[PDB]
Amino acid sequence: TAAVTTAWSEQFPNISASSTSRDINNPVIVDYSLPYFENNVPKDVGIYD
Amino acid sequence: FSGAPQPNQHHTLVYGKSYHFTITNGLPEFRHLATTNSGYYAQQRFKHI
Questions:
Q1: Can you give B1-49 as a three-state secondary structure string?
Q2: Closest residue of chain A to B20, computed from CA coordinates
Q3: Which of A19, A21, A37, A47 stands 20 to 30 A from B12 (CA)?
């Protein structure tokens, strides 16, 4: 209603990563199902393979 | 008729792993080792090898 000029601000509530560097965190999770009472389980994934 | 036995079994196995280790420095050190049966040895351990 009052289209007045505002002050400069670096505080972008959520600026796109297409305009600047932005932190993201999406760790991959490996599941090892245990459907039975006594399950057959493998050794942890050897990520280096 | 000419008989002949079954063969022996010959299986070939192929396994392998990959690891990530970390090692560090170490100065050389010495000592003398005494063991049962009057065993005596001069020892030199290379903590960097």
A1: CCCCCCCCCCCCCCCCCCCCCCCCCCCEEEEEEEECCCEEEEEEEECCC
A2: A48
A3: A47
Count of other CB atoms within 10 angstroms of residue B20: 7
Query: Which amino acid, A47?
Result: I
List chain A residues with CB under 8 Å of B18.
46, 48-49
Cα angle A13-A16-A22, degrees, rounded to a multiple of 5: 85
Q: Write the Ramachandran bin of B38: left for phi over 0, alpha for psi from -120 to 50, otherwise beta.
A: left
Provide the resolution (angstroms): 3.1
